[PDB]
Structures are given as C-alpha cells and as structure tokens.
Symmetry: C5
Subunit: 346 residues, 5 copies
C-alpha cells in the first residue's frame, strides 16, 4: 500500500484535473463553509485606541467532491502544511484586522484532514487586534460589546457562503480570566451581509458581551473622592476667627479635587459626551466649592457688623454654620442615593 | 468546456504574446486607470506625530485589449491571486505612506475579475498611516483637512493617467464613527500633478474635511479653568486683616493655573505660533495674577496710614475692594463674550 | 569515502522512499519526542500586560528508523540547516506565544545531528513573550508561578506524544540574575493534555516559582508612607491656639497620602480585588485622617466653653490631647505587627 | 518590431555575455555614480534618541557600455522592477541607518530607464531614521546640523566612486514645513572618505542646517518662569507683621520653580554639560530664593530689638525693605539683558 | 580571459566537488576563524530594560583550501552577495541578541573577497540590542561593563574555534560620542567557553568599560536636593511666636523632598538593594524631618511654662534655637564630606 504522502501526489498534482484555483461545485451551488472559533488568550483591551488583542483558532469545514477517495481504509488523513498550499482555501478575512500575523514557531500552525465523503477541516492560529466602537455614556457601569465579523473578499454570495455550526459555535478556554472585564456565557450570532459597489459578500459575526468590574475604580476614584468632601465638612466645626485655617482648608481641598478630576482621564479616549465619572467629579467639586462660598458668606456677615446690630449678626453667622453641618451631609447623601440607583437599572 | 483556470493558461502564459511587463495600448494613448476607495476603519489621528491610520479598499479599473475573450459565456471571471502576479498592474503609490503593509489573513486580500470587453477590476486592502500638515492657530475650533494623494512612480503622464470615477468616488462605511473628529459629507477631488527632474507623473487626491468636538476640551480645560478665576474673586469678600488667608488664596490659585497651563500641552506638537487655548490659559492667568496685585495695593495703603490721614485711607482701601467685586466679574465677562464670538465666524 | 553531504543525498532525496511529510513509525506506535529547554535570558516581566519575555533553547529528540545508517564510521553527523528543512519535524508550539520569532544572525540558529541507531537531535533558539495569569491578592508578598506549555497542533495523542527527559529537564544559566524576582531551584513538571472538538493532543508544561524582592517597595512605598503618619503625630505637641498651624498640618499631610496612594498603581493592572498595598495605603490614610478629626474635637470643645464650665472643658480638651500622644503611636504599632505577621505565613 | 520586454531578454539574459555580478568598465576606470535625493516627508526629530525620520527618493545614475542599444528608435525604456533585479546596481548604503525599509504598496517603488549611450537611471523610495550628534550647549538658540552620508560596502575607491551632480543636488518639496525646526536653503556638500582595515571607500554627505523656533519655549518655560519671580517681588509690599503670609509666599513660589526646573527636562537627553535653559531655571531660582533670605534678615532684625535701640532697628528693617523693591527688579533686569544678548551673537 | 563571475561557476558550482555544506579541513583540524568588529553607532543604553543598541561591522576571516586558485592574476576577487549564499559560512551568533536584523538598503550589506592562498574575508552589518547585567550599588558613580559574546551553535570545539586577531581587535569610530556614558580605551578580551548537555562550543567576548557623567545628575537631583535642606535651616531665624509660619515651612519642604525622592526612580529598574542616590534622598529627608522635631521641642517647652519657671524655659527654648543654627549646618557638612569621599575610592 502506498503511503498517504504519495497518494496525495495522484490527487493534488497535475493528474486527475485538480487545480487549487477552482472552488468546489463550480458552475453550481455555492460553497457552504461552516466555521467555529476557539478563544485561547483573550484580554488586553485598550481604551485609548479602542481595540483588543485576541488569539483564536480559526476552524473551517467545507465539502469538496474532488478530494473524495475510496482506496484508503481510514477516513482521516492528517496531511502536512506543504500540501495545504496546493489546494483550494476560502478567502476568509476580518473587516477589523488592523494588523495581524500567523504563528510559525518550529512549524506552521496549520491543520488539514480529509474525510472519505470530501469533508475538509482547516484549523490555524491567528492573532488579531480587533477594534470595536465603545459607548462610554456610563463608563464605570458600561456593558461592552466586542464584535468580530468574518467576510469574503473575492467570492460573492453566489459562490461562497459563511455560516455558523449548530453545536459548539464559539468555544471558550477553561482557565480564561480577565483582570478588568468578564466574559458572559451568552454570545449572539447574527449575519452582517454587506453591499458594496462590486457586489454582495457573506459575513458572520459574534457579539461578545463584556462588563467592567467596579472593584477597581471604587477604590481609586471614588473612595478618595468621597474623603475630600468630608475634608470640606470639617471646616464648619472650626470657629470663624481662624481665618487662615478655614480659608486654607477650603482651597487646598478644592484644588486637589480638580487634579484628581483632570487625572481621571489618563487611559480614556477624548470623547465629547459626558460619562458617569465626569459628573461624579463635577458634583463633588461643587460641594467642596460650596463650602468655600459658605464661609465667605459667614465671614462677610461677621465683618459687616452700636450694640443692637452686632448682637444679631453674630447669632445669624453662627446659626448658618450649624445648619451647614446637617445640610451638606444630607444634600450629598441624597445625591449619593440618586447616583447608584440611576446607574443600576439603565 | 475548459475551466477558467486552464483558460488563463492560454491567455496569461507564454502563448499569445502576452507579457506582464508591458502596459496596455503600448506605443499609443496612455492608460486611463480610474480609482475609487472605500473607508473601513478611520480614526486614531495622532497630534504629536501629525498622522492618522486609515484602512481603505483600493479599487483600480483599467482597460486591456490583450485580455479580451470571446469563447467564455459569462462576462466575469473571479480569478485567484496566483494569476494576479502574472499580469500588468499600475504602479500606484502614496506620497505620504510612512509605513504600510498588506493583509494576508488566511488569504491574500486581492480581487481580480476580467470582463469581455477588457475591463480589469483590481481591489485590495491597504492599511496606511498618512501624515497631514495641520494648522493649529485655533486648536479647539479648528477645521482639519486630511489629504491623501495617489501618484505614479515609473510611468509618466504620457504612459499612465489616474482619474476619479463619476459615481461613487469615495464611499464611507455606515457605522463609521469617530471619538474626537467628525467626517463631513463634502469631499473635494482635485489634481496634484507634480514635476520632478525626471519628468511629470499623474496624481489624484481627496480632501477630507474634519472638525473637532468641543464637548471634551470644554469639560477638562475650560470648566476647571473658569472655577479657578472664581476662587480669586472670593478673595475680595474677606477682610484685609486676614493676611495669611488672602495671600495664601492669591498664591495657591495662581500656581495651580500655571500647572494646568503647562499640562495642557501633553498631546500637542511643539509649534511656535500661539493657539486658541494658550491665550485662554494666559488671560485667565492674568486675572488671578491681578487679584494678587489688587490685595497688594490694598495692604500697602492700609499699612501706610494723626487721625486725619488714617480716617481717609481706610475708606479708600475699602472702596477699592468694593469696586473689585464688580470690576473683575465684568472684565472677565466681556472677555468671555469677545472670545467665543471671535472664534465662531473665523 | 563519500562526504556526509553527498551521503545525505542518498538518504534525504527521492531515493530510498524517504519523504519529509511522513512521521516515523507510521501505522504503528506514536512518536515519543523528549524535550529539554535551556534558559539563556530570563526577565522583563511586565505587570500591566501580564507577560514576560524569555529566550530558551528548544531541544527535541526523537527516534527515526528511516535515518539509520551503517556505512559511516562515526555516530554523529552535524548537518546543515539546508537539510533540516528536508526532513520530518514535530509540530511543537506554545499555547501562550503572543508573538514570537527566530534568530538568523549570520546563520539560522538550528542544530541537527543523527546517530547510528536513529536518534535525531534538534536544537533551535526561540524568543518567546509568554503570558501568565498572576494572583495579586498580596502584591508585595506574592509567589508568582510562570508556566509554559508545549502542545501539538496537527498530530493527536495516537500519533505524537511529548514527554520530559529524566536527567536535566530544565537547565538554568549560571549568571542568570533577576532585578525584581528570584528563580527557585524547584520546577514542577506535569501534563496538560487538552481536549478540543477535533481531538486530544499532547502537552508538557513547566511551572517556574518566582518571588518578589521586598527591598524595593519597602523604600519607595513603605518608608515614605510611614513618615507621613509621624507628621500627623507631631500635630499633638502644638498648642490648640495655633489654628492655622495644626489645621494646615492635618490637611497638607492627608492629601499627599492620597497622591501616593493613587500613584502607587502606575505599573499595576486594573484588578478588582484589593491587594496588600491598597489596605496599607488605606489604613495609614485613616490615621492621618483621624488626626484631623482629633483636633476638630479639641477645637470644638475649646470654642464651646461663667467660670465653672470653662475651667473643666479646658482640662478636658488638654487631657484628650495627652492621650492622643500615646493612643495613635500604639494603635498604629499593633496594626504594624498584625500586618507583617499575617502576610508571613500565608 | 519586437517589444522592449522581449528586447531585454536578448540583452539581460545569458546571451551577449551580460552578467549582473560584474560592474561596468571592468579591469579599467572605476564607476562614477552620481546621486541626487528628493525630500518628501521630513520631520519627527526626536531629542531623547537623537534621531530623525526622513523619506527621500534615492536617484542613481551610472554609465554602462554593456546596455547600449542601436535598434530601438526611442532613447528611453521604462522597464519593470522584475528586470531591475537582473542587472548590476551600486552597493550604496548609509552609515547611520538604524533601521530602514522599502515601500511596496501595490508595486515595488523602483524606477529603471536606459538611454542609448548607456545611461541608467535608478530611483527608489527609502524611509530612513537617521541619527545625528547634536550640541545642546544653547538648547533654545541652537543651530542643528543633520548629516547623512552615502558610503560603499563592497567596492573600494578604485572600483566605485560616488559624487554629487552639478545642477539640482538636493531638491526640497514645496509644501514641506516643520513644526519646530526650519530647513535653510544652504546645504553643504563635502566628502567623507573613510579608511578601515580592509580599505578605503567612497562617501558623499549633505549637511542640513536647522534652527529651532523660540516661539514655543518662550511661552511654556520662559513666561511662567518670569511670573514666578514677580510673585517673589510682591512679598516686599506686605508688612513684616504678617509672618505666615510672607513666609508662605517665599516657600510656595520657590518650590514650584524647582518643579518646573525638574520638569523642563522631559524630552531632553541626559547630557552632562549645562545648557541655556538650565542656567535660566537656576538663576531665576536664586532670585526667588534670595527673597526668602531677604525677609529672614528683616525678621531677624525686628525680633532682636530700652527705647533707643528699638527706634533704630525698625527704621533699618524698613529701609532694607524699600531698597529690595528697586534692587531685585533691577538685578533681574540687567541679567535679562545680558542673557538674550549673549545668546544672540554666538 | 574569463571574468571572475564565470570563474566562480567552475569553483562554486557542482563541479570540482565543492559543496557549501562542508566545513574546510574536514576530518582534520578545526577551523580557526578570527574576528574583529568595528563600532559605528553606539549608545541608547536603556536602564529599565537593561539593554543597549549597537551597530557593528562583523568581520570574519578563515582559510579554505577548496577556494585556492592559480589562474587569476590578482589576489583579490570582490564577489557579489549572490555567490555569498553558495559557500560555507561560520555559524556565529550572540548569546544576548534579544532581537536583531540585517541591513539591505538598496543592497545586502555583505562583503566577500578570496585571496590566492585561500583566505576568505566576510564583513556584514548587524544591528544588535545587547543585554548586560548592571550593578547599581552606586548609581551616580558606577563603572558599567557591557559585554558581548560570540558563540557557535552547530559546530563544537573540535570543528570550529573562534579567536581574536592580534592587531586591531576592536576598532572604534573617530566621531563616536555618548551623551551619558564614556567609552574607555581599555577593552578586555577573554574566553567564555560554555558547556551544555550537547557539548562544548567556542566563545569570544569583549568587555567595554563605561562610566557615567555626573554632570547631569548633579544639577537635577543634587543641587535642588541641597537647596531644600537650606529651606529648613532658615526656619530657625524666625521667632517661635510665628506658629503658622514655621510649621508650614517645616511641612511644605519635607513633603516636596518625598516627591523628589519618589520621582528620582523614573528611568531606573526595580532593584532591591539600596543605591547611592537612595541614601542621599533618605539622609537629606532626615535633616528636613529633624527640623520639624526641632521646632516641636521648642514649641512644647514654650507652651509648658509663677515667674521663676517661665524665666528659665524661655532662655532654654531660645538657647536650643541658637545651637540648631550651627548644629545642622555642621552635621550636614560632615555628612557631605563623608559622602563624596566614600564614593571616590570604591
Ligand atoms: C448551501 O446552502 C444553501 C441553503 O442555505 C443550499 O441552497 C438551496 O438549495 C436548494 C437545494 O438543496 C435549492 O433548491 C430548492 O430546493 C428546495 C428543497 O430543498 C425547494 O423547496 C426549492 O423550491 C428549490 O427547488 C435552493 O434554490 C437553494 N437556495 C438558495 C437561496 O441558495 C445550497 O444547495 C447549499 N450548497 C451546497 C453545495 O450544498
Ligand atoms: C485617456 O483619456 C484621454 C483624455 O483624458 C484621451 O485622450 C485624448 O484622446 C483623443 C482621442 O479620443 C485625442 O485626440 C483628439 O480627439 C478629439 C476628439 O475627441 C479632437 O477634438 C482633438 O483635436 C484630437 O484629435 C487627444 O489628443 C487626447 N488628448 C490628450 C491630452 O491625451 C485618451 O485617448 C484616453 N486613453 C484611452 C486609452 O482611451
Ligand atoms: C512511546 O511510549 C509509550 C508509553 O508511554 C509506548 O507504549 C506502550 O507500548 C507498549 C509496547 O512497548 C504497548 O504494549 C504493551 O506492552 C506492555 C509491556 O511493555 C504490556 O504489559 C501491555 O499489556 C501491552 O501489551 C502498550 O500498549 C503501549 N501503551 C500505550 C498507552 O501507548 C510506545 O510503544 C512508545 N513508542 C515508541 C515508538 O517507542
Ligand atoms: C571617473 O572620474 C575620474 C575623475 O574623478 C576619472 O579619472 C581620471 O581619469 C583620467 C582619464 O580621463 C585619468 O587619466 C589622466 O588624464 C588626464 C587628462 O584628463 C591627464 O592630465 C592625466 O595626466 C592622466 O593621464 C586619470 O588618471 C584619472 N584619475 C583618477 C584619480 O582616477 C575616471 O576616468 C572616471 N571614470 C569613468 C569611467 O569615466
Ligand atoms: C587552529 O589552531 C590550533 C591551535 O589553537 C591548531 O592546533 C594545534 O595544532 C598542532 C599542529 O599545528 C597540533 O599538533 C601539535 O604540534 C605541536 C607543534 O606545533 C607539538 O608540540 C604537539 O606535540 C602536537 O604534535 C596540536 O595538537 C593542536 N592542538 C589543539 C589543542 O588543537 C590547529 O592546527 C589550527 N587549525 C588549523 C586548520 O590551522
């Protein structure tokens, strides 16, 4: 019995009229190529460039009546990547590649096996940096949706159709974890058939639903932002005579809030719409700014006040100081309730 | 009937006298190659390097009488990229490439179809990082103009001419959005015929009109810059006796403005001309600096003042403090009006 | 006697029925390829991307009865990399490559020698940037575990099996030092046999146990963080009359702690769980914040106090100031003991 | 008449004894290759790495008697880059490449035309990142000199000589602008013949004279640095009784100057020699530091002063305060004159 | 006479029994390849990654009796890089490459000349980014030692030996300058013969002795660090009554020192051992911290003091203030002497 390598010479060579530039079922129905990808290393989701690097295994299955054999006993011939370049392959590509490369560490990472009926399996390893438009209207409580479409370039709809398989469409690794986001078990599968001036091409896309973990931003940009507001609340228990103490407290705490507000947009795009973290840095900046105007009103009334007028303005400048100890801890409290509840049902 | 792959062997091979190193219509009129590009992924417009990464589909159409066939029934032969390297192709390149590469994810992204009359369509996917000179005289209210020219390298004007098609010259994707800029529907199409020491070559360019969204810079560099000026206005309601309070307020607020003025040029080139944001950081720095000189004049008059001279300087040092509460909120207001109106018609 | 180069022509050529696309022992037992790697340049372990660049020498040994010779006297034929591409090689790859390349400086860094019995040695140089999931629950006192698996891509378990050799499995260079971590002499060797929808493949992995050196973080984020707490302890020896002195001391030292707490996450991922350095920056921030509330209580009691009530509140506002000089230096001391002991046995 | 493509087969092929590995005029005079470059995209001049990226068109002209034809009517044959690799080309390279690549966007950007007398034109597009040693003794008022040399590698002086053409040696694009530097119209052309242990090789270099635009650094590091000195001058109009006001003014303004002095070396190499901007940040730091020692002398004399000694020290502590209002605004003024004049003739 | 190109066909072709896969002097003594490198562009020595980019010319000389000719008159045949790939070349590589590439700007930068006796010169251009372990025990006064070893990969000691030439081993360019380090004229040449599990290979290395220039760090991290200590010395000339002045001076100057101490490790690895700059930032931080405790002791004694006890504590609180004006300027002076002398002989 001749080995499978010499058997491919009589099937892939110039004999039998088999050419690698002809699609199967020519002058007939289009080729239905089913695909299923396996995610190996997901993560590294940048926000300034709005892209994410993923390493998937692209599997392609299509029927080819020209490769059907009957003399070989087994129904699986794991060939060599050398014969892989001498056959026909679908022109599958991604519309959001933005730079990609293969992996040829000691061997071109390609798979090729042919069944008796003509089934051809084609599995390779591709590293992609896919771009996805993100909506940052509520940045700390956003639901990301990273999509990836698989289009055709040379073959139109009447010559090649891409579809998803029924069982096991998108497999996920067991020990695949993410530091910031989380990968939900629900993945939508829809069509993305485009229409250009040349024609229409097939397209299959998968929608990965992600969600950020608030455990990181809560400690960096929320807990320190909440303590600065408390630093302005303590400015009311000090007597009005200590002018350099209360003025310096109302200024040193209002400028460090602007620094944290300006520094909270380091790893963020320059979007125009306001997000959920910008209003938090803005409203909390208003409370520490209102504390400055609070003492300014108390100081102006105290310095404006023979014995009948001064006996009432002192009681007025002190009464407003007692209300401020209950007003701001309650106005900021009702805002803290209306903030997390509004961003919990949207 | 022989397949189209074997038919190309009798048309692209050594037979019929067809060579891939000869342009169509040799020793006659030049080749008129019409082009139309489709934008897939636009964005990532850097400002320090003054470049932007774009992913376009370069389509080229040219007539070739040597490829006219009459035996094949259909008028479209979607060939393989293997035969694409055995024919003649225009030497189209960009004068502002600055690094570029193709996309060969599982298939070389090339398109080739030949009609009966000799029409040859050539569509590929090219990722370009194009450089464009930007005028930042008014950075927050600028109108960017990103151009891209398509020149010839080996064929002069009398051998190859590039032109734009009539219908559908520059197609834009439907879901193409930008975080900072906006892509207008008006795209100019002009010629850029260059003249070197070797000769003259064809050139076609498209002018993309962009515009920044002020919604981002208004919240980061304008709202905090406006609140610092208010921190200097509150220094007038405090009595002149509180020297460590008003001095510290006039210094802690004037130095944080310089930090924001120096930190507002992070993602900006080192241009010499002054922009619209530099004068805003400069004039607002003058207001918070004038508040320091305002108290310095009040403190100097108060410390200079038997009972006839001291009874008038106290009334003078207090009258100037009452005018400053109306002067600066009005001088800064008329400047705020003359600022946004001047940069709204230019 | 013919040279070994011409002898390979009669062994690797079309004669003798030897093809490079057939694995040894075909239609029989699988090939048992033993591997052992040598680490040349280890280090550069990034934390934001969670990867590390390593340069190893991949040695592969497998038997091949088709290469057994008997005419050559010696038992070692150091061939040329040209003949290396004309033989069969295992399809070894890594599941966490994330970009890799070879080294061809003046010569393709490949090794190939064939023994008389059929032993084939294959040594090459590969530069890998391997990703590893890290658990940062206790960042300054963590025990890293960098793993690297060697899987098969085209050959299943019944066709190719990877195993580790007995003596000298993972060799380490003599002068291999690390600036941050340390490489322990204990390296675990286990199996990682995966199961996909196509089939099962062999897998061998090595677990490198690393450990950070606390000598760096102790000086940057611990010693300065401990001195700031002492700056708040000195606020008790100052009299209560100095309001601008004690207030400014309690605010200038509590805001610089937040800056160090926010700046301590520069080269750190955005993980949600709290680490050992976040609680240190949080508890120490509570001590410098409690010093602010300490003086606020003393100032409020002093300003609230004919001669019977004022004679007791002054003694009360001074007694609490004497307890604070012993309380905080002891509450922070017992926390400093419970901190390093808890992170010394876990 | 045979086409020019088939005519090259009888001239570039094995016939006529023409080989691509033999230089013209063998066993005789050396080849005189004249070169002229065209600058397309200049700029991106980094300062930390001391390099600049340039995109030039390298044109090469040399005579070759083996390519002289007499049957073709025209005197220009624009060939294909395929025949370009089958002829002899000079081994021109740059001694300061530091990474380079070609441009093959849809066509290898190469030019090849042969005249009747034997003139061969060779124009290509090369992107170079050239390194140049810069002298930063006066950084804001420096005159940069970026050089680029074209050496030979395999052919010595007696086999190949590089020279510049007479008319149009270095052409510059019309719309070529720079954000920081300026390209002068004077470009020196000299020789750089090197002598190694192997032999001597030809070399041609061009000296591009650049000059920075002070309009950028004047607004960022000079105007804010001048206002801080004024903040220390206002410390003299305040009474000596305001100790927390004048001390805080002399310290908050002297520490922000050190921050600007340390932050003014971000995009700068770590050179040892002092530059023109370091002395400006040093002398201006001395003025704001002398203001601290000025009040320290006034405060020490005021606190040292039955009625005869105190009546003179108060007049002395006030007289020195009046001289400081004229001394420092004049000592800093004469330094400001001696600074810009010294760096205007050197 | 036949040209040298056609003469190589009778020497490098299949005739004469010359094969490119056989080393010279087979079945005999090993090949002694002498090497000498020329440094073109040295510098760019990173500290975080601990590597440096160098551009050297790798020259290799070895005897080959199979290339000896007698018919050609001259003794030098400068061949083409095409024939360079058809001969035998040593398998020279570097053990610390970490990414490398060649230079093929318009020509593969290779040199090949063969003498009559059989001497073969091989010169190429290689760009290397070499890693070197650095000892930063005394960072500002360190003596760097960058090494680079040239090992063999396929040929053992008994088949190929690398050695350095006698005259002109390591040539240095004339205009080669460095911004930070300096290249000494003393370069050690030793052997680095390694022993692996496969065998022993030749190795030659050169030790480049470097030294940093203190002129940069003296102005950025030493002069500003020395002025901050003077800001704490001036806190003694102010009266003890000015509590908000001396407290604010002792805190604003002690926190900016921590910022400079934390910011002095930007371009530095995360090593555990303490360096010479860390102790300078630590001891100087102790002086500005001792000034805070100095006033705390004076303030506590002043606030503790019918007329007999208060008449002595005031004289005691003032006497300690006079000693502090001589103590700290002398304790810091003797430390400044013991610092530069200790790091001048080690
Ligand atoms: C690839 O999949 C498509 C469907 O997604 C297959 O096409 C449809 O194929 C049928 C033949 O099986 C075509 O004929 C029709 O048959 C149905 C009964 O199955 C009958 O009810 C209809 O009236 C019609 O006669 C049908 O036109 C075709 N439709 C389309 C839109 O293509 C296709 O055959 C598959 N290709 C291969 C190679 O299997
Ligand atoms: C490519 O397009 C150019 C025009 O952009 C074509 O060229 C012009 O072509 C005409 C022939 O169609 C040349 O002849 C002239 O004909 C006109 C009538 O159409 C007549 O009024 C003139 O007096 C003249 O006889 C004309 O010289 C030529 N002009 C130029 C500037 O090239 C060209 O033919 C097109 N090429 C192909 C292959 O179609
Ligand atoms: C590669 O290694 C495997 C083991 O890891 C070898 O396989 C085992 O090989 C034996 C033959 O040596 C097979 O037969 C059995 O022999 C044992 C005695 O050694 C006997 O007790 C059993 O009842 C059985 O008859 C055995 O089935 C096989 N097992 C597996 C799981 O593969 C294999 O032969 C090695 N390959 C080469 C080419 O050396
Ligand atoms: C390339 O250019 C060089 C000059 O840069 C040419 O070389 C010089 O060429 C002349 C022949 O033209 C050699 O001969 C001499 O002729 C002059 C009159 O022109 C005569 O006064 C001298 O006494 C001598 O007989 C001369 O030796 C040579 N000099 C050098 C330094 O090379 C060269 O011919 C040019 N190559 C080609 C291929 O055109
Ligand atoms: C490459 O260099 C080595 C030395 O580094 C050469 O090897 C030594 O070569 C000599 C022959 O010249 C061998 O023989 C001996 O000769 C000496 C007199 O020179 C004699 O005193 C000894 O008793 C012995 O007979 C010697 O064994 C050998 N040693 C080693 C360690 O290799 C070698 O010949 C050079 N290769 C070529 C191709 O020139």
């Amino acid at each position: 019995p001749m080995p499978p390598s010499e058997f491919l010479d009589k099937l892939m060579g110039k004999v039998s009229g088999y050419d690698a530039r002809i699609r199967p079922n020519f002058k007939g129905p289009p080729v239905n190529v089913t695909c299923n990808i396996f995610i190996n290393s997901f993560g590294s989701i940048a926000e300034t460039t709005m892209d994410y690097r993923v390493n998937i295994f692209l599997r392609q299955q299509w029927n080819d009546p020209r490769l059907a054999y009957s003399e070989y006993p087994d129904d699986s011939l794991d060939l060599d990547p050398s014969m892989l370049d001498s056959i026909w392959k679908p022109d599958l590509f991604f519309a959001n590649e933005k730079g990609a490369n293969f992996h040829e560490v000691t061997t071109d990472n390609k798979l090729l096996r042919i069944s008796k009926n003509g089934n051809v399996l084609y599995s390779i390893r591709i590293t992609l940096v896919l771009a996805c438009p993100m909506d940052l209207k509520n940045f700390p409580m956003d639901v990301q949706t990273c999509i990836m479409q698989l289009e055709s370039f040379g073959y139109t709809m009447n010559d090649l159709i891409f579809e998803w398989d029924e069982k096991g469409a998108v497999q996920v690794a067991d020990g695949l974890t993410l530091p910031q986001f989380i990968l939900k078990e629900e993945k939508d599968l829809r069509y993305c058939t485009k229409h250009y001036n040349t024609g229409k091409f097939t397209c299959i896309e998968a929608r990965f639903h992600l969600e950020r973990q608030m455990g990181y931003y809560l400690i960096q940009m929320y807990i320190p932002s909440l303590l600065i507001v408390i630093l302005s609340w303590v400015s009311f228990w000090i007597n009005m005579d200590a002018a350099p103490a209360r003025v310096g407290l109302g200024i040193t705490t209002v400028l460090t809030m602007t620094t944290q507000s300006s520094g909270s947009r380091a790893s963020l795009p320059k979007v125009s719409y306001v997000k959920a973290i910008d209003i938090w840095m803005a409203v909390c900046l208003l409370f520490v700014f209102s504390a400055l105007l609070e003492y300014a009103a108390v100081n102006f009334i105290a310095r404006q006040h023979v014995e009948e007028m001064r006996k009432l303005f002192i009681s007025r400048a002190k009464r407003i100081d007692t209300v401020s100890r209950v007003a701001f801890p309650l106005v900021f409290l009702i805002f803290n309730i209306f903030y997390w509840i509004t961003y919990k049902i949207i």
